[PDB]
Amino acid sequence: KTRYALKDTDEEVREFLQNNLHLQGKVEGSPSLRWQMALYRGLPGREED
Amino acid sequence: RFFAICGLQEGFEPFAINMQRPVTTWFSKSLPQFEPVPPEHPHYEVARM
C-alpha cells in the first residue's frame, strides 16, 4: 500500500514484493496471528501448496 | 457461528480471544438492600443537624 501511495504500477509492486517476501509476519512473534492462522488453516480448501 | 462470515475480515476480534478463565459476569439481583442516600440524589436530601 505504501508503494501504491508512491504511484507505482502493478509490475513495480510485484517485483517489490518478490524481493521482500521475507517480511511477512511470524506466528510466534505475534499473539494475534496465533489464532488467526489456526482459523485460516481450518478452511476446507486450504492447501499448503 | 457467524464471526467468520461477518467480523473476521473486518479486523474485529472476539471479546475474550486470549483468556484462560471464562469472563466473569455480573447480574442485576432484584433483592432490595439498604444503601446510603447519595449526596447528589435528585429528589432526597439528608441534613445532619
Swiss-Prot record, chain A:
Tissue: Detected in skeletal muscle (at protein level). Fast- or slow-twitch skeletal muscle.
Localization per record: Sarcoplasmic reticulum membrane
Superkingdom per UniProt: Eukaryota
UniProt PTM comment: The N-terminus is blocked.
Domain notes: The calcium release channel activity resides in the C-terminal region while the remaining part of the protein constitutes the 'foot' structure spanning the junctional gap between the sarcoplasmic reticulum (SR) and the T-tubule. Pore opening is mediated via the cytoplasmic calcium-binding domains that mediate a small rotation of the channel-forming transmembrane regions that then leads to channel opening.
Family: Belongs to the ryanodine receptor (TC 1.A.3.1) family. RYR1 subfamily.
Oligomer status and interactors: Homotetramer. Can also form heterotetramers with RYR2. Identified in a complex composed of RYR1, PDE4D, PKA, FKBP1A and protein phosphatase 1 (PP1). Repeated very high-level exercise decreases interaction with PDE4D and protein phosphatase 1 (PP1). Interacts with CALM; CALM with bound calcium inhibits the RYR1 channel activity. Interacts with S100A1. Interacts with FKBP1A; this stabilizes the closed conformation of the channel. Interacts with CACNA1S; interaction with CACNA1S is important for activation of the RYR1 channel. Interacts with CACNB1.
Miscellaneous section: Binding of [3H]ryanodine indicates that the heterozygous channel is activated by Ca(2+) concentrations 4-fold lower than normal. Single-cell analysis of cotransfected cells shows a significantly increased resting cytoplasmic Ca(2+) level and a significantly reduced luminal Ca(2+) level.
Function: Cytosolic calcium-activated calcium channel that mediates the release of Ca(2+) from the sarcoplasmic reticulum into the cytosol and thereby plays a key role in triggering muscle contraction following depolarization of T-tubules. Repeated very high-level exercise increases the open probability of the channel and leads to Ca(2+) leaking into the cytoplasm. Can also mediate the release of Ca(2+) from intracellular stores in neurons, and may thereby promote prolonged Ca(2+) signaling in the brain. Required for normal embryonic development of muscle fibers and skeletal muscle.
Name of the protein in question: Ryanodine receptor 1
Annotated organism of origin: Oryctolagus cuniculus (Rabbit)
Full-protein positions shown: 3537 to 3585 of 5037
